[PDB]
Curated annotation (Swiss-Prot), chain A:
Name of the protein: Beta-arrestin-1
Organism lineage string: Eukaryota, Metazoa, Chordata, Craniata, Vertebrata
Entry-linked PANTHER family: ARRESTIN (PTHR11792), BETA-ARRESTIN-1 (PTHR11792:SF22)
Subunit composition and interactions: Monomer. Homodimer. Homooligomer; the self-association is mediated by InsP6-binding. Heterooligomer with ARRB2; the association is mediated by InsP6-binding. Interacts with GPR143. Interacts with ADRB2 (phosphorylated). Interacts with CHRM2 (phosphorylated). Interacts with LHCGR. Interacts with CYTH2 and CASR. Interacts with AP2B1 (dephosphorylated at 'Tyr-737'); phosphorylation of AP2B1 at 'Tyr-737' disrupts the interaction. Interacts with CCR2 and GRK2. Interacts with CRR5. Interacts with PTAFR (phosphorylated on serine residues).
Localization terms from the record: Cytoplasm; Nucleus; Cell membrane; Membrane, Clathrin-coated pit
Curated annotation (Swiss-Prot), chain B:
Gene name of the encoded protein: GRM3
UniProt tissue specificity: Detected in brain cortex, thalamus, subthalamic nucleus, substantia nigra, hypothalamus, hippocampus, corpus callosum, caudate nucleus and amygdala.
Complex formation: Interacts with TAMALIN.
Protein name: Metabotropic glutamate receptor 3
Superkingdom of the source species: Eukaryota
Family designation: Belongs to the G-protein coupled receptor 3 family.
Compartments (UniProt record): Cell membrane
Species for this entry: Homo sapiens
Segments traversing the membrane: 2-23
Length: 347, 49
């Protein structure tokens, strides 16, 4: 009554079957990566087949490519001898074994929590190599031990995903106010901004309520209200990639020493912002279109690893500038069945 | 010596600008947090001058 995903190998016909492409991330624990393999004997002695899960992290900037260096680290590597020529079976594994036959051999992994979610940095038009970001791979090798070089004639590769979804609890609603005292004696000026809630589903409008009470003789020239996205990187001491993904330079002149309150709407979306290379987007299987990065939440007690993406609405007032940052989180709701992992209409 | 100092005022201005920009970039961990060493060097160069 269900379906799985299958990949094959030329020499050994090592048919790797996986229950799902993605694996949701509860903060306490990650859903298990459970699957099976059909391993027809294409040998007489090479009776070992190994399954390796690798949470690779690749990175490289424009000037890094110009100089000729790009970093890549294996955050987590797991090797299991799935064929006993341990790991008690599961329901889906049992159903697959009943379908498959005797040669079906299970393999089960668990991803330790707080590992970074599958987030890929958007490549530029010139960028054509392996995509930069956090990508999870499951591979199968038909060899003996690990002394033999991993031969492409036998290996099987599949790209999996680890993602998070918005919690039911909204959390504290973001809100921030700042009053600046100008150089003319101590004359204040108050700015306040508030959001609708803390978790926003991708594409939903953001109704930032902004109110300014100027206790001065000056005038507000313009109001730049933007949605900045910060993609911190926790390896090789790389800087914090900051990038505005939505904007509105709404100009409004307000009477000196007076009040003015209203709401400004901003919506992040990939249509207007498809050029800013290095932007963090959700996991791409094979260069497919994906939304922005799902804002990771380290609710556990935690360790900074991988790419930590977050979003904050920054409101700036000109004359220097009064700036206020309201952090929040952009993430999908809980899907019913699963994401299609591709554009829903293919072509 | 007054003329010599009038000559060196441009390097003084250059040091001022470099120190200000190093201060503005205290927290860039690039090159194993080389920005911190840049800021410290600018501060102590200002002190010695």
């Amino acid at each position: 009554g269900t379906r799985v995903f299958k990949k094959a190998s030329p020499n050994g016909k090592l048919t790797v079957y996986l229950g799902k492409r993605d694996f949701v991330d509860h903060i306490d624990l990650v859903d298990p990566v459970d699957g099976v393999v059909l391993v027809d004997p294409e040998y007489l002695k090479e009776r070992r087949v190994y399954v390796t899960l690798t949470v690779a992290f690749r990175y490289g900037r424009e000037d890094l490519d110009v100089l000729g260096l790009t970093f890549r680290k294996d955050l987590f590597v797991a090797n299991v001898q799935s064929f006993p020529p341990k790991k008690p079976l599961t329901r889906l594994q049992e159903r697959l074994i009943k379908k498959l036959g005797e040669h079906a051999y299970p393999f089960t992994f668990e991803i330790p929590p707080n590992l970074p979610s599958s987030v890929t940095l958007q490549p530029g038009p010139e960028d054509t190599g392996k995509a930069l970001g956090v990508d999870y791979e499951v591979k199968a090798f038909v060899a003996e031990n690990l002394e033999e070089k991993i031969h492409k004639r036998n290996s099987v590769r599949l790209v999996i995903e680890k993602v998070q979804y918005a919690p039911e609890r909204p959390g504290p609603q973001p809100t921030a106010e700042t009053t600046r005292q100008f150089l003319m004696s101590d004359k204040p000026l108050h700015l306040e901004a508030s959001l609708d809630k803390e978790i926003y589903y991708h594409g939903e409008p953001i109704s930032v309520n902004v109110h300014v009470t100027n206790n001065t003789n000056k005038t507000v020239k313009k109001i730049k209200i933007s949605v900045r996205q910060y993609a911190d990187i926790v390896l090789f001491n790389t800087a914090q990639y900051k990038v505005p993904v939505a904007m509105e330079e709404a100009d409004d002149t307000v009477a000196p020493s007076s009040t003015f309150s209203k709401v400004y709407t901003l919506t992040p979306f990939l249509a207007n912002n498809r050029e800013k290379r290095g932007l963090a987007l959700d996991g791409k299987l094979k260069h497919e279109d994906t939304n922005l990065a799902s804002s990771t939440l380290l609710r556990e007690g935690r360790e900074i690893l991988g790419i930590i993406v977050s979003y904050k609405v920054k409101v700036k007032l000109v004359v220097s500038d009064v700036a206020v940052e309201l952090p929040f989180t952009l993430m999908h709701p809980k899907p019913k069945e699963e994401p299609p992992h591709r554009e829903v209409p293919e072509n | 010596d007054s003329s010599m100092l009038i000559s060196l005022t441009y390097d003084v201005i250059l040091v001022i600008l470099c120190t200000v920009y190093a201060f503005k970039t205290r927290k860039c961990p690039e090159n194993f947090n080389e920005a911190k060493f840049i800021g410290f060097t600018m501060y102590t160069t200002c002190i010695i001058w």
